[PDB]
Design an enzyme around this catalytic site. Structure first.
Site: not given
Lengths: 339, 341
Positions: B174-180, B78
């Site tokens: 949560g419907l963000g890029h991954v969510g949706y 990291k």
């Protein structure tokens, strides 16, 4: 740790820790403007991490200055290994340290220092080639010794008017490999030689084989003489010992002679010429570094031969500025490293 | 900083400061046993160095566990870059960071993270090849969602007897890029798809485009359902929220779902199966890791299978050992990282 780095203007700091071998290592890379950073590795007990880290950082900045004024294509670095209490297998520890070095890919080149030996450099060498002062390599002490001898000649010239040494009283503090070799040069030249060392039998050898006049260590540093040559532990010059000096000049092989930068003005304010340790004692570094990079033999002799001449130049600038030669050397180094 | 590093079993900590550019950068290489260390670069304000350094250490450790369970020839690392209060300019600093990475010879490969963008990766790319997630590189969100989908199928089987999502009630939070994209994958499986999200058009989009049921954001975590899929903020799993849950499993894309490790045991106590977040959401990581090494699309699919395979392995030992899947995962990771092999 960034505050520590920033105060030293240190480029990079690397810590490796490995419980299979007990390795706790610090590699500090102060500068690489002039080249890969070369500096020795210390294996020592430490009160705490921040003391070990702090020690690596300061010493690495020292190497950058020393390498810069020796005119090498070399930056300053320093490794510090925190001595464990236990340690089952030293040797396997130093093989891990060599893998640590490798992981930096030649940015850092290692060497011997307090608590390490060419024995440990041999183990390091198993895992990387960015190592020096192996057992197969020489002992570079003679080059250090002859460099300081040259530098004492130049300091007597600047301070006393003549580079002749016969009959001069010269006090050599410490009779390790470098100190004895310097003393031997001094006896051959016909200097009036005063010696001291913690090992009574080293002093006996120097009395028996050099005709050295022996002194107790507490007395040596303040005896009246023409030139005092510190060749033992660092910090030999304090505000205290500078007030009791009776030499006309200080010029020796030991590293980190000044306890604090401020002392160099105490020396000049008494009129005692001081040969900046890291200029006058670089002969061992010049040889190890050039041999490690495979430089031309003509270049090796040329660089070694320049030590007294470098001192002469410094000495001239310091006079022309009513400044301590340590100040002159520092600012020269800064311009090279930070200009 | 050796107490920290020894606590985390961290191989190596590296620091670079450059006052000309304002770079104050940490690179923590936790493990390089399975391969060169791969990890995001975050660029954030920090109250003190000890805070940023300790962050780098702790996140690089997590990345070693994540890479190991994901079956990658990858180590955990990291980078943390302390954000200076006044900087001009950005691109020079990240070019300097690019030089810092290159100085480590490919032992550390960087990626985007909180505070950095593909644009900053573009500047890093001028000084080293050991960088991922540039602008020219494909979005990894679809792969994350696909891996979470497969992960959900494997949680259905372990918790409900079969991997058939047809007619299951799955709530996505949560419907963000991954969510949706997970929601889209679920509708097509034939599942009853409940949704919530902070943006309302996000909902009517999935309502319109997928057959989703709109659900209020603040009551989604307690609605009767078969599987809850957190794909929003971390820490949605607290002692309080776990008490109110009405689902049989939890399996979603969000990082740092567990507010602290006890929640794993409170979920076990309630009989709710928990998919370890850093295992189920590894799909972005698998894709980026493999693309960087130049792998064929077949090899990405096969490697992506590690998510359902590993989740199934974890669920089996969890049952046999009567332990949380979160605990099984950590011990498998530790076996791979610090054990003999």
């Amino acid at each position: 740790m960034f505050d520590m780095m920033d105060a030293a203007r240190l480029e990079g700091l690397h810590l490796a820790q490995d419980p299979a071998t007990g390795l706790k290592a610090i590699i500090a890379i102060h500068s690489t403007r002039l080249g890969p950073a070369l500096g020795g590795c210390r294996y020592l007990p430490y009160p705490n991490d921040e003391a070990a880290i702090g020690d690596a950082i300061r010493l690495a900045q020292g190497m950058s200055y020393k390498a810069a004024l020796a005119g090498l294509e070399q930056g300053g670095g320093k490794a510090v290994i925190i001595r464990p209490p236990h340690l089952d297998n030293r040797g396997a520890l130093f093989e891990a340290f060599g893998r640590f070095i490798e992981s930096l890919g030649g940015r850092y080149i290692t060497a011997v220092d307090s608590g390490t030996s060419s024995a440990d450099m041999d183990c390091i060498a198993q895992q990387t080639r960015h190592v020096t002062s192996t057992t197969q390599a020489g002992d570079p002490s003679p080059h250090t010794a002859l460099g300081v001898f040259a530098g004492i000649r130049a300091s007597a010239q600047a301070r006393l008017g003549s580079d002749d040494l016969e009959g001069l009283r010269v006090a050599v503090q410490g009779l390790g490999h470098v100190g004895y070799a310097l003393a031997e040069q001094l006896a051959a030249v016909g200097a009036e030689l005063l010696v001291c060392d913690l090992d009574p039998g080293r002093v006996q050898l120097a009395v028996e084989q050099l005709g050295a006049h022996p002194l107790a260590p507490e007395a040596l540093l303040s005896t009246p003489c023409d030139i005092l040559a510190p060749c033992g532990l660092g910090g030999v010059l304090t505000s205290q010992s500078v007030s009791q000096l009776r030499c006309a000049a200080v010029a020796g092989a030991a590293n980190n002679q000044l306890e604090r930068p401020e002392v160099a003005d105490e020396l000049e304010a008494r009129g005692i010429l001081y040969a900046p340790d890291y200029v006058i004692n670089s002969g061992g570094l010049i040889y190890v570094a050039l041999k490690h990079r495979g430089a031309d033999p003509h270049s090796i002799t040329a660089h070694l031969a320049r030590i007294p001449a470098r001192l002469t130049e410094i000495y001239a600038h310091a006079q022309a500025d009513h400044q301590s030669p340590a100040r002159i050397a520092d600012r020269l180094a800064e311009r090279i490293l930070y200009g």
